[PDB]
Amino acid sequence: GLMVFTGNANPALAQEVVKILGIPLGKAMVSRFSDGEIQVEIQENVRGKDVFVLQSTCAPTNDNLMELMIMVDALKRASAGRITAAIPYFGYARQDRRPRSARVAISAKVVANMLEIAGVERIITMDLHADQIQGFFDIPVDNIYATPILLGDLRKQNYPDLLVVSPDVGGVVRARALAKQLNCDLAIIDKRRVMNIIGEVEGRTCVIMDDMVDTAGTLCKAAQVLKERGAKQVFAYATHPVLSGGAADRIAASALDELVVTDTIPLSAESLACPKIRALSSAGLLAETFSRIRRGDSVM
Amino acid sequence: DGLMVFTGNANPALAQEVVKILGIPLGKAMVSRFSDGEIQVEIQENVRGKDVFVLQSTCAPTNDNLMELMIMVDALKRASAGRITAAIPYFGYARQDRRPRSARVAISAKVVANMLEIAGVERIITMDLHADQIQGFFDIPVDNIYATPILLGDLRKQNYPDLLVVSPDVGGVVRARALAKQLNCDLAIGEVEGRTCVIMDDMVDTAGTLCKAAQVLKERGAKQVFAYATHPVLSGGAADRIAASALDELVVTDTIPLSAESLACPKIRALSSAGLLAETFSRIRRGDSVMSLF
């Protein structure tokens, strides 16, 4: 019953997922017409099958979302038994509210509604930006943590004298949790009119952990501030390597020693040319989730 | 009064011309991008209880323009707009209106219909919808307006001798004979020598079909060949192949903005659909008959 299809966002990652699952990748043309409208054709029988669609909605965001939307409709109309959208990086997640009642959209909610009306029956996502996005859906949402992958690597590196750093006074909650888990010290960076650091950073190898890195502006600003307070090294772990706005070259010039990321969003040719950026494989964690959910489907 | 018109980046010049005719300013909005390319939207004006029309064709880039419309509609809805009408002169994805011999494809135009309704769109205005059945993909009111008064207006103005209407296709003889009956001239699909031939389509994309017909018609001795179409999709080497073709001119509307290479091509002339849209909006606002116009 289990089938897996992919869009163009992450096709290599999907091949690794099905490899582990011991199944072939479902065949589909996912392409464009001459005018740039999305052309999709499911090129095998999906009738009554349990279908997973692996497509992060990373850049180009709207294209990847519409690829997903259209694939879902084709699968629905071809009478798939069940449709799951596996969206490791969730595009528009950062637009989850209207700050100070600004006349903006709650885009994460539009996307939620979009997927539901296309006929998506459940969501799998990774390190979702805000827990509250789960309530934008009236269908089941499974949010998986890539923390094991990242902590796995950080441990292999055996850094002395490890210290977790919270870049801002947001995730102090989560930074203490990480520091408790590796039982090391915690330091916090903040700006009161980035100036203040509480906890001495002097002899420390500092580590920063995040859901995503975008421009890398925060990571790189934090890293300097740490080397300015004597830090030996600064390392950044992040699940989703968005890496827009000349981030790779900003990283290249920074006080940051290394950026470790997941392969949810494949690396640019620029990023692959950047020795400070290194990827880890999220495929095993994805396959394990697909298998747990599949087990549930065969209960009834 | 109460009426407001907004626009994304699909067709800004058309929007400006529409509001000029309406006698109102364009609604203030930032429709932009974040560094990662996700759409950035803020309504920069009060819209509470207002009768809001969003003017955005879902032309290329199709998905970006559709999502701008989606996100603007959400922004407006949450800012408590009284009513939201999507004015989509060119409806992208309209050609995916079925599954051919039931191939395992999407009915994309239905997906988009569902998306707009779920975002909070209450009414649709569109021009020369590729398929009339698309009106049935919606459960909200759909007004399909026609560029015929513009295109026929201009064609009649030209005052061509020995005027003959041609269906380039076969799946177009119905519309073509209706057009022939309205111009009272003969119809070809027929006899052609010595006569000025006119083709009317709702759409022009690559022009491959268009230009082939012009060639064939001339071979059989057509005096001149003219083409009239509402929507200038015009990809990818369309403008170039129209230039190099037996086609004397191609007249279109401005529902899709012309490219640089299309603006360079001296055979492509574009007519404003702005008057047609503005009168439509205006009639809708007063409850007057829209049908009348066509």
Place this chain on the structure above:
Amino acid sequence: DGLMVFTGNANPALAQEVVKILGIPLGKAMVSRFSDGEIQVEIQENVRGKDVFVLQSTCAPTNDNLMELMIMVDALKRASAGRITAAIPYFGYARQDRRPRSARVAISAKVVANMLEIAGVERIITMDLHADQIQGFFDIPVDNIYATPILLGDLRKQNYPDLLVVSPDVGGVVRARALAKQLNCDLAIEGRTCVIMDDMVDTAGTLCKAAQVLKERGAKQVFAYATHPVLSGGAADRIAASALDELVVTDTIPLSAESLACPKIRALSSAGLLAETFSRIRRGDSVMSL
């Protein structure tokens, strides 16, 4: 196994033949009328957890046959059917699929799509749907099957001399070339045997004009094939009197008394094609492979 098939009054005989082929009994139901003419339905056996198919063309009397299907679906749903599929070989209201230029009309085919879905229908099976765009009126899966195999089966079965596929209307000239290609014969818009193929026949007006103007101008024989025999308002008389040599149709709509009487009208069984479609769907096999 967990498969159940019920019929309304639109096509009882056909449903019995489908069900005979499948090797199962027809589902026990009363589908009838109260004294005032309101639909009376009771499901007279247990359906819970079962995979229920209802076979009902919404041919004339359209609204009664449509309302029978609505009421049956509701009763089945409330009797906890595991799943409901409406098998509607002829889909009534299919010709109302748009609003023409200057007409304040309903898109009735869509009202019907909405009705069916709100009743609890989960999957549609239909035959030679009049406009493919109707599939987009539903947000449930729709399987449109073709009667070409049973029509072409019969056509080849009588080895007509000098066969020529004819397109009568300008509309379906495209698929007329696709038919000719499949029989490897010519296409027309003389002294040959002409076959016309169609989705349906209603008044037979255009068929009969076509048959005449083919005959006037030469043709040996004229034969017509159409899946759906609607055949309303004088159709049988118009056909008897026409240049047609035979009209061949399927049994998705049972022949009225007048059509039965007309020796030019011959009906083929669609039961094997419906029964194969049910099995393939049930097994998860591909339908379009047919």
